[PDB]
Amino acid sequence: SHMEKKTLSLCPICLKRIPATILEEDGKIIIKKTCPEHGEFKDIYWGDAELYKKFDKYEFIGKIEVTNTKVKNGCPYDCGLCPNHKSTTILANIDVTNRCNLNCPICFANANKSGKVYEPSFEDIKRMMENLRKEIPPTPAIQFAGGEPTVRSDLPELIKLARDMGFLHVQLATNGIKLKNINYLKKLKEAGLSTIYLQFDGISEKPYLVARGKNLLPIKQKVIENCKKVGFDSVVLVPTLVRGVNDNEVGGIIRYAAENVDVVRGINFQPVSFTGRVDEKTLLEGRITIPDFIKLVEEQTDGEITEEDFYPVPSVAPISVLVEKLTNDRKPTLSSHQHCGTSTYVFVDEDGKLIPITRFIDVEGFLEIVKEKIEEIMHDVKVLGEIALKLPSLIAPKSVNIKKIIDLILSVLKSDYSALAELHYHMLMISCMHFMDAYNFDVKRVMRCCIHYATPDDRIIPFCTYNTLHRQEVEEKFSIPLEEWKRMHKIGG
Ligand SMILES: CC(C)CCC[C@@H](C)CCC[C@@H](C)CCC[C@@H](C)CCOC[C@@H](COP(=O)(O)OC[C@H](O)CO)OCC[C@H](C)CCC[C@H](C)CCC[C@H](C)CCCC(C)C
Ligand SMILES: CC(C)CCC[C@@H](C)CCC[C@@H](C)CCC[C@@H](C)CCOC[C@@H](COP(=O)(O)O)OCC[C@H](C)CCC[C@H](C)CCC[C@H](C)CCCC(C)C
Ligand SMILES: C[C@H]1O[C@@H](n2cnc3c(N)ncnc32)[C@H](O)[C@@H]1O
Ligand code: MET
Ligand code: SF4
Ligand code: SF4
Ligand code: SF4
Ligand SMILES: [Fe+3]
């Protein structure tokens, strides 16, 4: 064995803060911890030690300025955001309901299993948005979740509100069932929705039977069909990855998304996180980590995408630092922990093969130049020109006009969000974020968390502490018993 780090974790029994050791063992990264009352625990932290060490070099420590709570009990008990948090809200979640038209066996929110209805008012949601916009820099992206947001009749008005509040990106996490109605999808599109974060467990029926309790695959494909018909070209497929259920369909999901790249902008795989409601078989067997996913991509894409093509999230953090000094304005920085997730971008050519952007562009060299020019940054245009002149030396699909890609990359360096958006329409994002549970919790990771829930009590809580420590507290305070809520609201709320 070989000790890598010391950190703090949580006891899976009593959720107490306990010491933890991260160590290399048989080519894998495991985490060991000891609760003074419940003994010692062991879990797989990362399935590949070599990729763990490689990602460790992209560490980036951010900074916050606007807080909502104070230091009282220490991390992870002071969410949030307390003075010791190291990242501002990049993507915010607002749970608009705990009601749902499904009853999935796997659900980190554990919806419908409380006998109480949590549905913040339009005015509560606007106040939560104001808290998010008060940050420095203001939160640029917001996602409605739950729960199933489409069971609220005012969801189009909520989407319009997010646009009126200044959010550049408005996202909808949904099972997509109500989106089989093409007129409703039109209402969401006209309301200003940016992206549909679509639950999508596989390309065959069995993953939906195991994870959702029924075959939703025809409904999923109908949603994709309706998105083509109305021109909604920003869909992200979200497979909950479970070993023994859909780890064999990683390539199939990618290939199906590539066939529909006109509407599908990405696939964000989510390894099953043992929070909320998990069936006893998935809880015991289906533990999979980020490098295990990277291995599945390389195996099930026949080498088209390799482990060299995947980068951690904070690798692009210096890009925001460069634009920040280039414009003298605070920019949202992807300062999450290097072991929270990974991503790559691929182009789809004529035959259908997948060319990662790392295949024909020296991304590691581009980031190297960006880091070099941060110290040096009339001279700023020369720096941009030097970058513009050094970009051809770091460069491929024939159907890709590489000259417009260069212009969009350089425009992104000028805080041009519309260039960032247009650049994503040329590519297919393949990513994976592994949310922590009580078994693999790492305080050093969650301190840099960039994905936060806005709560009705004026707090902003990192995703991984909210779903392990805070969700029941918050929802119970602001919920109404089901029997009384039904008798005071219509089916739409
Ligand atoms: C270069 C490589 C080596 C990799 C480098 C590192 C890599 C980590 C960098 C990643 C950067 C990336 C996240 C940046 C995304 C920017 C992008 C969203 C900007 C907008 O990009 C354009 C959007 C569409 O937006 P519009 O054009 O405004 O609206 C069009 C509208 O439909 C009009 O009808 O499509 C595009 C849609 C996007 C693709 C959507 C991305 C969504 C995220 C993946 C969502 C992540 C969610 C979290 C895991 C939280 C989940 C919470 C849940 C569990 C409740
Ligand atoms: C060029 C090639 C070779 C390499 C890089 C490829 C490229 C596609 C990567 C892009 C990475 C970006 C972070 C870079 C953007 C850089 C910014 C400085 C651009 C600034 O312009 C947009 C600013 C808004 O600024 P103002 O409000 O002041 O006008 O951020 C507003 C935009 C922000 C970024 C909103 C982001 C929205 C999404 C939904 C947030 C997701 C958050 C997750 C933590 C990330 C996903 C993680 C994976 C593992 C799922
Ligand atoms: C918001 C997205 O999260 C997915 N999802 C639901 N439960 C879990 C879990 N335990 N782990 C990971 N992802 C999950 C949903 O299927 C939806 O697509
Ligand atoms: C707990 S998941 C909440 C979002 C939505 N119900 C989905 O499954 O995609
Ligand atoms: S996760 Fe962040 S906000 Fe929450 S207690 Fe830790 S440092 Fe503070
Ligand atoms: S995972 Fe989503 S769709 Fe399934 S029960 Fe939970 S909230 Fe509803
Ligand atoms: S939500 Fe969890 S996995 Fe994602 S950045 Fe925050 S702490 Fe890391
Ligand atoms: Fe304990």
Author numbering: -1 to 375, 380 to 397, 402 to 499
What does the paper say about this structure?
To verify that the enzyme binds archaeal lipids, the protein was incubated at 40 °C with a lipid extract from a Methanosarcina acetivorans cell lysate to allow the exchange of archaeal lipids into the active site. To obtain a more precise picture of the GDGT–MAS active site and a better understanding of the reaction that the enzyme catalyses, we determined a 2.05 Å resolution structure of the M. acetivorans lipid-exchanged GDGT–MAS in the presence of 5′-dAH + methionine. The [Fe4S4]C is 8.0 Å from C16 of the phytanyl chain, which is close enough for the transfer of an electron from the substrate radical intermediate to [Fe4S4]C, or perhaps even close enough for [Fe4S4]C–substrate bond formation.
Here, through the use of X-ray crystallography, mass spectrometry and in vitro activity determinations, we show that the RS enzyme encoded by the gene mj0619 from M. jannaschii, which we designate GDGT–macrocyclic archaeol synthase (GDGT–MAS), catalyses the formation of the biphytanyl chain during archaeal diether macrocycle and GDGT biosynthesis. GDGT–MAS contains three [Fe4S4] clusters and a mononuclear rubredoxin-type Fe2+/3+ cofactor, each found in a separate domain25. A central RS domain contains a partial triosephosphate isomerase barrel fold and site-differentiated [Fe4S4] cluster that is common to all RS enzymes. GDGT–MAS forms the biphytanyl chain from substrates containing fully saturated lipids, indicating the formation of a C–C bond between two inert sp3-hybridized carbon centres.
